[PDB]
Amino acid sequence: SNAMERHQHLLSEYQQILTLSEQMLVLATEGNWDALVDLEMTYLKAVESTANITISSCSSLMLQDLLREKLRAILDNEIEIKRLLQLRLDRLSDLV
Amino acid sequence: SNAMERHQHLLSEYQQILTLSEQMLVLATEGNWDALVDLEMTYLKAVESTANITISSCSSLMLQDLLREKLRAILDNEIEIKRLLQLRLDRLSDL
Amino acid sequence: SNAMERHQHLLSEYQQILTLSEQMLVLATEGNWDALVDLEMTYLKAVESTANITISSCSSLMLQDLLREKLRAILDNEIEIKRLLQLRLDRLSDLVG
Amino acid sequence: SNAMERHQHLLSEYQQILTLSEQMLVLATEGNWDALVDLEMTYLKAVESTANITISSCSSLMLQDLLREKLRAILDNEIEIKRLLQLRLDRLSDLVG
Print the SS3 string covering chain C.
CCHHHHHHHHHHHHHHHHHHHHHHHHHHCCCCCCHHHHHHHHHHHHHHHHHHHHHHCCCCHHHHHHHHHHHHHHHHHHHHHHHHHHHHHHHHHHHHC
**Which amino acid is located at C65 in the chain?**
D
Q: Within a 10 A sphere around the Cβ of D34, how many other Cβ atoms?
A: 8
Using alpha carbons, list the distances in angstroms from residue C8 to A54, B6, C45, D55. 19, 19, 18, 13
Answer yes or no: do C22 and D77 touch at CB < 8 A.
yes
* Set of chain C residues whose Cβ sits within 8 Å of the Cβ of D32: none
Phi, psi of A31 (to 5 degrees): 80, 10
- Give how far Cα C22 sits from Cα of C43, C45, D51, D75, D81, Å: 11, 16, 19, 11, 10
Longest dimension (CA), chain A: 59
Q: Which residue type sits at D5?
A: E
Q: What is the DSSP letter of A59?
A: S
Closest-CA residue of A relative to B8 is A63
Q: Are A92 and B89 in contact (CB under 8 A)?
A: yes
Residue spans per domain, chain A: 1-96
Polymer length of chain C: 97
Alpha carbons B72 and B82: distance in angstroms, whole number: 15
Inter-chain CB proximity C52 and B58 less than 8 Å: no
- CB of B87 within 8 Å of a chain A CB? The answer is no
Q: Which of B65, A10, B63 is nearest to C1 (CA)?
A: A10
CB atoms within 10 A of CB B32: 12
**Rounded Cα gap, residues D92 and D97, in angstroms:** 10
Which residues have a Cβ under 8 Å from the Cβ of B69 and sit 6 or more positions away? none
Q: How far apart are CA C22 and CA D77, in angstroms?
A: 7
* D26 Cβ under 8 Å from any chain C Cβ: no
Q: Give Rg (Cα) of chain C.
A: 17
- Chain C neighbors of B2, CB-CB under 8 A: 57
CA distance B4 to chain D (A): 10
Mark C75-84 as b/e (b = at least 16 C-beta within 10 Å). Answer: bebbeebbeb
> What is the Cα B4 distance to its own chain's centre?
25
Minimum-distance CB partner of C25 among D60, D63, D80? D80
This PDB structure is determined at a resolution in Å of 2.1
| Residue A42 CA, distance from chain mean position | 7
Cα–Cα distance, C78 to D85 (Å, whole number): 15
CA D39/CA D84 separation, integer angstroms: 17
Looking at residue D59, the DSSP 8-state letter turns out to be S
Q: What Rg do the C-alpha atoms of chain D give, in angstroms?
A: 17
B61-93 and A2-29 helices, crossing angle to 10°: 20
Substitution target in C85, C86, C94, C95 with the highest count of D β-carbons within 10 Å is C85
C88–D84 CB contact, under 8 Å: no
Put residue B41 in one of left, alpha, beta given phi > 0 → left and psi -120 to 50 → alpha. alpha
- CB B51 within 8 Å of CB B78: no
Chain B: residue whose CA lies nearest to D6: B2
CA distance A89 to B17: 25
Cα–Cα nearest to B54, from C8, A71, A19: A71
Q: Please tell me the CATH superfamily of domain B1-95, with its number.
A: Flagellar protein flit. (1.20.58.380)
The percent helix, strand, coil of chain D (3-state, each to 5) is: 90, 0, 10
Q: How many helices (H) and strands (E) does chain D have?
A: 3, 0
Residue type, A63: L
B32 touches chain A (CB under 8 A): no
Between the two ends of chain C, the Cα-to-Cα distance in Å is 55
- CA-nearest residue of chain B to A26? B81
DSSP per-residue string spanning chain B: -HHHHHHHHHHHHHHHHHHHHHHHHHHHHTT-HHHHHHHHHHHHHHHHHHHHHHHHT-S-HHHHHHHHHHHHHHHHHHHHHHHHHHHHHHHHHT-
Strand blocks (E) in D1-97:
none
Q: Say if C64 is an interface residue toward chain B (CB within 8 Å).
A: yes
Query: Residue D68: exposed, middle, or buried by beta-carbon count in 10 A (0-12, 13-18, 19+)?
Result: middle
Distance spanning both ends of chain B, measured CA to CA = 58
- How far off is chain D from B2, nearest CA to CA, in Å? 6
Identify all chain B residues contacting C57, using CB atoms and an 8 Å cutoff.
Answer: 2, 56-57
At the topology level of CATH, where does D1-97 sit? Methane Monooxygenase Hydroxylase; Chain G, domain 1 (1.20.58)
Hey, what long-range contacts does C23-29 have (CB within 8 A, 24 or more apart)?
Answer: C24/D77, C24/D81, C25/D77, C25/D80, C25/D81, C28/D80, C28/D81, C28/D84, C28/D85, C29/D84
Residue A23, amino acid: Q
Task: Find the residue in C nearest to A7 (Cα).
Answer: C1
Give the gap in angstroms from C-alpha B89 to the nearest C-alpha of chain A: 6
Cα separation of D20 and C77, whole Å?
10
Coil vs helix vs strand at D60 = coil
Residue of B nearest to A47 (CA): B51
Contact D18, D2 (CB under 8 A): no
Contact D6, C57 (CB under 8 A): no
**Within 10 Å of residue C55's Cβ, how many Cβ atoms?**
22
Identify the three-state secondary structure at position D58. coil
List chain A residues with CB under 8 Å of C5. Answer: 2-3, 6
The nearest alpha carbon in chain C to B56 belongs to C57
Residues of C in contact with A57 (CB under 8 A): 1-2
Cβ-defined contact of A14 to B50 (cutoff 8 Å):
no
CATH superfamily of the domain spanning A1-96: Flagellar protein flit. (1.20.58.380)
SS3 letters across D32-56: CCHHHHHHHHHHHHHHHHHHHHHHH
